[PDB]
Design a protein around this ligand. Structure first.
Ligand SMILES: NC(=O)c1ccc[n+]([C@@H]2O[C@H](COP(=O)([O-])OP(=O)(O)OC[C@H]3O[C@@H](n4cnc5c(N)ncnc54)[C@H](O)[C@@H]3O)[C@@H](O)[C@H]2O)c1
Ligand SMILES: NC(=O)c1ccc[n+]([C@@H]2O[C@H](COP(=O)([O-])OP(=O)(O)OC[C@H]3O[C@@H](n4cnc5c(N)ncnc54)[C@H](O)[C@@H]3O)[C@@H](O)[C@H]2O)c1
Ligand SMILES: O=c1ccn([C@@H]2O[C@H](COP(=O)(O)OP(=O)(O)O)[C@@H](O)[C@H]2O)c(=O)[nH]1
Ligand SMILES: O=c1ccn([C@@H]2O[C@H](COP(=O)(O)OP(=O)(O)O)[C@@H](O)[C@H]2O)c(=O)[nH]1
Lengths: 336, 336
């Protein structure tokens, strides 16, 4: 097998204490499962504001703490366990939600990461890994494909603003207090573990609508593109970031390095679900000025030996399977 | 006289309603005086957390509202007047204060500017001018002299972080809602109107100590440099930013474009005050990693016809005069 660094680099988590904020969500549920498999003791802190307790994997060594990253009482409760690793995935999500609710977005994404960083400073951590966003740091003035040095300060939603703000604070803690941080810049993550809903991503919403035989609403002309990254590839990146010394202090894109049109994505989902309803065209969402996103993943290749293992098609099949296996829980949980 | 654009460009403020948040402070007191002279009706919103009511100039057309930019009640009180211009100078100041009190710094600098921007959106403004910071947006990875495109996301204090955050939000309101914003990047402002104190700038603190015949404490070796910008030059820049259409959506350095050593600055102050106590050397402050600051002011030249009129020496003489004329008020007010 070629998977020597994926397997034995990660055994480094065995017996370690890992706090995952936002651990009941899409990336979090996948990450926490893999950490538990690697023998970590995992603490999830999540307020379930955009996630469901049933999504958390069932492992003896995962402890679920329902609470808010803005609440200093619960923060002391988890940080007195002295986590060796913090993966900070909790966030007010995402673009539209943030335009509607900019102050709550700042409190959760700004004051929330600041508090979590402050407690991490008090106890000391081997690593603090933050889920930043490609959309959040690359602007219309950034060249495609996006390289990590080529960030923008001219953004289109409060979510984008506060994703960058997170990097501003992790870099600050690194610079002044020598905290070993890593800034992961995710690109349109998808896969098992994202329940559909009003403020959620297009792929799970399209699966939900397609499986109710509804037409898929395309917000644009369909030629808009995204770099969609399968969640298990994201997780492999994150786990590498926790242990590689060369990741310390760095910002690193986690993407597929390929782009697909919205119309293709919709076609694949309709094909897999045997949806006869096709698509309908709607106007672009007003804040959606960045209609092409494509990452450069060469830095991740260099520092992490990161390489996506799952094709777009394979990813969508795995997503479909999760939908069919959990359809009743999803039906009940989805809030539009 | 050569001052045609300084004089008749600014008559544009005559009869206009101008809100100046942070208006009782150093830059604010100077700005509000000049706006009142130009015939503007001025509303100051200031909580006096680092300023004194005696500093506000006495003009019939200045209305002082004691209140907090985080308080939605007082925000409605000032914004129902329908200001034509907003100059947003209110800020939790500055580097050390922010390291000590990072959460309050974020609430004031982040949530505060967000709220003020939200109300400006509701009423509509001809211009929203924000006092960002050279120190806040240029890093160790930025080339000296600092040009406006060459920003950094790797900062050294929470104040630097939240100064950049302000630009992130003004750019957002410009991008999504077409708010006519301008981001002014000030470089080490000095002059009449800054009372000395624990968390204040070096020049007024040095005047206060020198006028008590105390040695001036140099935090470093004295070869550290700053681009010190006289407050009346800053004010001329700001007033141009309010009226020039070419400033809309732009980030622009307001500096002197020259650097001076700390040791020279100290020597001049000791000379003017006839201080016999000289200097003493202390360690660098731990967050003070940027020991050279120098702006490029060519963009301001191009867009605003900005040109500093007051030399470093002349500026320090004017500062000295303000100290001697207000010595008793300063003695009483200074909090160390
Ligand atoms: N999904 C993407 O395409 C994408 C892209 C870039 C970045 N990210 C980032 O990655 C992280 C995880 O994304 P995701 O897709 O799993 O989203 P998600 O919504 O599934 O996960 C976030 C979790 O945080 C929780 N949370 C929200 N506010 C909280 C608060 N105040 N206190 C505690 N918990 C709170 C939610 O309940 C949720 O379970 C987020 O930081 C997100 O911004 C995601
Ligand atoms: N002085 C400099 O060298 C420099 C450099 C770069 C940027 N700036 C920026 O320029 C602006 C003005 O600077 P300054 O030198 O006049 O500082 P200052 O402290 O004299 O002025 C700021 C004012 O804001 C007020 N304020 C603070 N918190 C408030 C709150 N929550 N609500 C309402 N009012 C509040 C203070 O009481 C004060 O009068 C600030 O935004 C500052 O960050 C200054
Ligand atoms: O109901 C939808 C939602 C999204 N999209 C398109 O899908 C792509 C990604 O949308 P998503 O909201 O998942 O992520 P983001 O826009 O934040 O990248 C964008 O081009 C959207 O215009 C769509 O066609 N229909
Ligand atoms: O008591 C002091 C305060 C400051 N400085 C020096 O003066 C310069 C500017 O300091 P200030 O705090 O005024 O502004 P900032 O450091 O935020 O630019 C820096 O090189 C400081 O090290 C000093 O020598 N003694």
């Amino acid at each position: 097998h070629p998977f020597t660094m994926i397997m034995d680099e990660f055994r480094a988590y065995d017996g370690k204490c890992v706090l995952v904020t936002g651990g009941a969500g899409c990336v979090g549920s996948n990450l926490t499962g893999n950490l538990a498999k690697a023998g970590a003791n995992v603490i999830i802190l999540d307020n379930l504001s955009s996630s469901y307790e049933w999504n958390i994997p069932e492992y003896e060594n995962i402890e679920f703490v329902k609470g808010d990253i803005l609440d200093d009482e619960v923060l002391k409760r988890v940080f007195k366990e002295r986590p060796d690793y913090v993966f900070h995935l909790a966030a007010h999500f995402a673009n539209q939600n943030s335009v509607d609710n900019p102050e709550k977005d700042l409190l959760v994404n700004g004051l929330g990461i600041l508090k979590v960083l402050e407690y991490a400073q008090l106890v000391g951590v081997e690593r603090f890994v933050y889920s930043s966003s490609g959309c959040g740091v690359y602007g219309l003035d950034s060249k495609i494909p996006f390289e990590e040095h080529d960030i923008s300060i001219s953004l289109h939603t409060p979510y984008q603003v506060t994703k960058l703000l997170g990097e501003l604070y992790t870099n600050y803690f690194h610079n002044l207090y020598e905290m070993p941080i890593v800034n992961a810049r995710f690109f349109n993550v998808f896969g098992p573990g994202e329940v559909p809903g009003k403020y959620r991503n297009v792929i799970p919403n399209f699966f939900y609508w397609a499986m109710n035989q509804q037409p898929l609403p395309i917000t644009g002309d369909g030629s808009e593109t995204r770099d969609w990254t399968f969640v298990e590839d994201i997780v492999r990146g994150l786990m590498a970031m926790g242990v590689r010394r060369e990741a310390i202090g760095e910002a690193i894109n986690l993407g597929s390095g390929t782009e697909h049109q919205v119309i293709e994505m919709a076609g694949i989902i309709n094909e897999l679900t045997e949806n006869p309803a096709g698509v309908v065209y709607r106007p672009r969402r007003d804040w959606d000025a960045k209609t092409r996103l494509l990452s450069s993943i060469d830095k991740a290749r260099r520092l992490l030996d990161y390489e996506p293992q799952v094709s777009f098609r394979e990813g969508l099949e795995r997503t479909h399977r999760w939908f069919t296996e959990n359809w009743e829980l999803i039906r009940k949980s989805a809030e539009f």
